[PDB]
Amino acid sequence: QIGKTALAVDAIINQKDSGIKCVYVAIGQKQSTIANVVRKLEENGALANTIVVAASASESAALQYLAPYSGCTMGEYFRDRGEDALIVYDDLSKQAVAYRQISLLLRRPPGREAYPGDVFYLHSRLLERASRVSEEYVEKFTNGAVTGKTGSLTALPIIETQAGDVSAFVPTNVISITDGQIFLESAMFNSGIRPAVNAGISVSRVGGAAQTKIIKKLSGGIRTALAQYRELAAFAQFASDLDEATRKQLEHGQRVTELMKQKQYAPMSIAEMSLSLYAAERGFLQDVEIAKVGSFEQALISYFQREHAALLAKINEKGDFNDEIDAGIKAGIEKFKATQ
Amino acid sequence: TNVISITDGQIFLESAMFNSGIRPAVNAGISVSRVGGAAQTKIIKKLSGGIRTALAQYRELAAFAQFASDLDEATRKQLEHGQRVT
Amino acid sequence: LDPLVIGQDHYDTARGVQYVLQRYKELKDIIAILGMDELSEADKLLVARARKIQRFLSQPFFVAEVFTGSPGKYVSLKDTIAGFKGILNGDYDHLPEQAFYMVGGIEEAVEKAKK
Amino acid sequence: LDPLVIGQDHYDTARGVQYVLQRYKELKDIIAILGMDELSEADKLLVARARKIQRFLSQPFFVAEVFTGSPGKYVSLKDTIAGFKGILNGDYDHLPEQAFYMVGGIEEAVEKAKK
Amino acid sequence: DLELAHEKAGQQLREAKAQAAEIVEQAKKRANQIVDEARDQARTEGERLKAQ
Amino acid sequence: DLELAHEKAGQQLREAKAQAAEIVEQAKKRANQIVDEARDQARTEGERLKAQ
Amino acid sequence: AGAKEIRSKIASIKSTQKITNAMEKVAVSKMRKAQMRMAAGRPYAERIRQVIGHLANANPEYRHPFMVEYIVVSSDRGLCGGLNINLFKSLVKDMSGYREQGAEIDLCVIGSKGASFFRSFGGNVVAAISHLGEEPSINDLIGSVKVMLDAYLEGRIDRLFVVSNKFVNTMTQKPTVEQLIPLHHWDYLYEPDAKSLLDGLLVRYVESQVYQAVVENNACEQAARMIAMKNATDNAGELISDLQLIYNKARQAAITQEISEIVGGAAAV
Ligand SMILES: Nc1ncnc2c1ncn2[C@@H]1O[C@H](COP(=O)(O)OP(=O)(O)OP(=O)(O)O)[C@@H](O)[C@H]1O
Numbered sequence A: 001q002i003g004k005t006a007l008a009v010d011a012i013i014n015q016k017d018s019g020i021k022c023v024y025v026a027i028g029q030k031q032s033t034i035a036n037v038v039r040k041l042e043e044n045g046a047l048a049n050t051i052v053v054a055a056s057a058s059e060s061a062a063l064q065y066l067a068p069y070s071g072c073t074m075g076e077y078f079r080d081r082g083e084d085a086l087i088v089y090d091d092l093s094k095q096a097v098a099y100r101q102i103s104l105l106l107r108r109p110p111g112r113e114a115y116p117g118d119v120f121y122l123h124s125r126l127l128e129r130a131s132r133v134s135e136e137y138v139e140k141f142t143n144g145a146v147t148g149k150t151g152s153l154t155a156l157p158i159i160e161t162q163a164g165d166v167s168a169f170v171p172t173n174v175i176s177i178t179d180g181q182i183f184l185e186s187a188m189f190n191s192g193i194r195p196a197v198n199a200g201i202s203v204s205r206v207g208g209a210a211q212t213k214i215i216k217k218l219s220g221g222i223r224t225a226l227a228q229y230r231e232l233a234a235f236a237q238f239a240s241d242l243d244e245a246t247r248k249q250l251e252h253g254q255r256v257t258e259l260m261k262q263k264q265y266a267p268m269s270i271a272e273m274s275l276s277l278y279a280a281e282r283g284f285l286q287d288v289e290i291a292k293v294g295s296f297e298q299a300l301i302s303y304f305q306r307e308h309a310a311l312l313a314k315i316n317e318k319g320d321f322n323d324e325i326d327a328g329i330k331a332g333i334e335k336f337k338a339t340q
Numbered sequence B: 001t002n003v004i005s006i007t008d009g010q011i012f013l014e015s016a017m018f019n020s021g022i023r024p025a026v027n028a029g030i031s032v033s034r035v036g037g038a039a040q041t042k043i044i045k046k047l048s049g050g051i052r053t054a055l056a057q058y059r060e061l062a063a064f065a066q067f068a069s070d071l072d073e074a075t076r077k078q079l080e081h082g083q084r085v086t
Numbered sequence C, D: 001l002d003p004l005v006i007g008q009d010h011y012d013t014a015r016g017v018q019y020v021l022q023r024y025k026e027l028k029d030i031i032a033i034l035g036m037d038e039l040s041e042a043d044k045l046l047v048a049r050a051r052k053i054q055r056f057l058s059q060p061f062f063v064a065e066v067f068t069g070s071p072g073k074y075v076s077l078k079d080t081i082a083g084f085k086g087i088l089n090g091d092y093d094h095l096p097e098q099a100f101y102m103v104g105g106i107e108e109a110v111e112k113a114k115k
Numbered sequence E, F: 001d002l003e004l005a006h007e008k009a010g011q012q013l014r015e016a017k018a019q020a021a022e023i024v025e026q027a028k029k030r031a032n033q034i035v036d037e038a039r040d041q042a043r044t045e046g047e048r049l050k051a052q
Numbered sequence G: 001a002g003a004k005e006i007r008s009k010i011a012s013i014k015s016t017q018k019i020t021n022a023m024e025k026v027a028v029s030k031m032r033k034a035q036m037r038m039a040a041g042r043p044y045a046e047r048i049r050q051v052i053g054h055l056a057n058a059n060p061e062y063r064h065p066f067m068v069e070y071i072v073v074s075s076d077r078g079l080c081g082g083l084n085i086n087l088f089k090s091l092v093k094d095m096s097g098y099r100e101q102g103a104e105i106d107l108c109v110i111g112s113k114g115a116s117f118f119r120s121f122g123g124n125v126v127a128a129i130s131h132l133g134e135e136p137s138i139n140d141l142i143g144s145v146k147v148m149l150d151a152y153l154e155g156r157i158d159r160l161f162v163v164s165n166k167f168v169n170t171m172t173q174k175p176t177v178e179q180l181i182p183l184h185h186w187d188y189l190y191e192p193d194a195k196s197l198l199d200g201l202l203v204r205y206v207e208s209q210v211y212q213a214v215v216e217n218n219a220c221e222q223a224a225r226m227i228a229m230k231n232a233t234d235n236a237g238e239l240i241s242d243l244q245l246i247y248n249k250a251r252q253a254a255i256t257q258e259i260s261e262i263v264g265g266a267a268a269v
């Protein structure tokens, strides 16, 4: 109950105009929870671009064990034909529990927590299919019908931990297979930071290669700067007044911490995220109160949407950046703060 | 646990002492020889008594080394001796 | 890591760095409950050097440019020894803590402090 | 517990109560060793409201009457939101902490404080 | 200095009238944008003739 | 007198800014009425067709 | 999670307990340094009191304004066992009493914790000094004392007092309020006129009483700090004891679970 499904469903909703096909695999969930996710996809206009594969809690452990592979096969159809797809496995920890049941009933000898010996290979065989294939692979698969195009399958597996314990056998295996992880923290979620992403523990192994030019430049070093701010805020909590270098880092980290907060079912485009990142890293938030950062961002976006619509449309074409766009954003933010 | 119960004594080496520059790393506060003084020559048996006492005093007073300017002279004498023996 | 294999200057620098970081590990928990002001004049200075040493261990790699954004730095054995001896002897006590974070050799740390 | 189901007033009151109780839970170890007097002027005010919220959550039930003797209380959603919103806003900062324990609606905390 | 103070007060007074007019003008421009976006949302919500 | 004139300039800016916030909040309040009345009409027509 | 996290918490709290035990003896040592400084300043004040008594009795020709009808001392640092709170609690009783009488009140502040209190409740401070060493010098008090003396000569103050803690014993610090301004067969050879001498000696007397109040409050502070660090050392011991019981439970459960998995795996093979 800390937003794991909310993060993956919002990521599927954002692809309705991206040209990426979606697959949602529900393993061991109750049928009314599955029906509510489908209603939310339909209300947000994302259902026409999504395949929903269901293996609910009352279904045979064999169907729950096979569902991720069936959904993967439906996603691979697009990858092999020079198209892009996205797949969500809402609970690989429930697939592992279904596999453990079958294996114990077949009388195969148990391991580290009664789990089968090959529980690592269960997930590694599934997750290594999510990949990007070369133009030569697509050209060979389609017998020359598709040329000069790469194909891909992106995966968003979900795992549940017990009281934050990552030392469990299944969580240990999956963290060691993926190209990165997003850790959600219950203490941050209770403290009102609702996307609840722990920036210190979370990491992406592809980094800047997976970003557009504008976001790559405006976000360089933010993750490690927040990781150092969390430590600084705890170290300087009870000490007497420190130097300008310490006050500058602390006051900036507090503003980026309040900025990273977002609501559910409210995605931002490249231009909206770019304005928000630019106003923070270029120092424009230094005069703004922490309790006003959300109101400042919402008003700035609404103002650029009415008075600078042609600039947002230019940033949203490919996420390009240059001195003309940099100066254009600067002039707009200065005029905003000096008049609204 | 089995081998500690079978042997006549134990020499305990510690990672915290070894990283603090104390190279032999022997934690003299928990290490013990049940044979004791019977396994020593007359000269080492006579000199080792004051040294065990100094390291015991140092282990009790070590927290005051950062505040030695506020100690009583009689206590400062034990601390400075304990540091040199250590 | 033996004076008979490398040399006494290298070995003393390595053990010196380790000594400073080992002492800081017990003070980290003290500062978090009772604050920095309750430490001794020698402890306050040592903690500042330990936090600087902890940052001077960092270095941007050529294979990590995609993650870090900054360019990669190769540092030599003599350059490494000289940089750590300088922080241990107090030659950089006036530089801010953030100047040693991600900067190859010791020269670049003196330059980062000016930015 | 969604703004689209219960409305923004209920949702923000519930989120406000959880934020105060979470921050009070983080201070428990510091308060246990050093006491409340070492906290900041902001944390002291938050801990005082957290203690009042924690006590106002209590309620005498009509099935629990045999255990103690006190009469049971039924509190409407409107009265529930009004009480916690007032405690979060600071409208009851002057009333004593024991006035919120076992009283049903918020107006009864005002009458209990008269004793 | 008294004559100059009255001329300065005459500038500060009219500049405050102009800024207050622009602050309310921008608010009315923002209010108009909110209602037009709400009309497009309500018009798009009409998907129910086919989505249901 | 010039200090009182400066205070009056600041006072009207704070008043205009307070009214600007109220004008935008009334627009947000209006948007929800426009959207929810469209939802109830569209769902009611859907039931009208479903019964038939 | 398990035994590993509990073992780390125990070591952390144990490291903190060792220094609070040392800080108690450091506070006792500094308490003795403050007590010797309290005694060293008494001869000067009693002798100035003996001179003003004769120099006023023998000269009925002149009455100084100080002979016919608040300065608050506080610490600059943490670990005070209710020292400042018990003093402010005692002061508020007399300030409220002055408002029942309808009189206006002027306040003077010594120390950083006193300034923060009045700033959080809107108290009107006429003068303030802070960041003084644990062994203060009388030349720093001259400023704050003069502003309060001038307010008396200007007729703005009817009575002046020094608010500070008194050292009853090493285990008891008493909050107090003491009045400052409103206090046999031979005569002296007055070199300057006796009026000029009385004006200077009364000022030296009031400054000396404020310095003695400040030094005795510092002795009370070290005694309060001793009790606070003794309590912190004892409170940490209870937390260590509870964590050790939780650790032993996790130690026994881990062995029982490992044995259950080994017996379960060997029954299948
Ligand atoms: N960005 C957000 N802002 C506010 N609330 C959020 C946000 N993201 C998630 N939540 C809310 O917090 C809860 C998260 O539930 P969600 O089902 O997504 O978590 P979960 O980890 O998948 O839970 P579960 O273990 O039951 O599957 C929901 O009430 C959701 O509406």
Ligand SMILES: [Mg+2]
Pocket (backbone or CB within 6 Å): A004, A005, A006
């Ligand atoms: Mg979920």
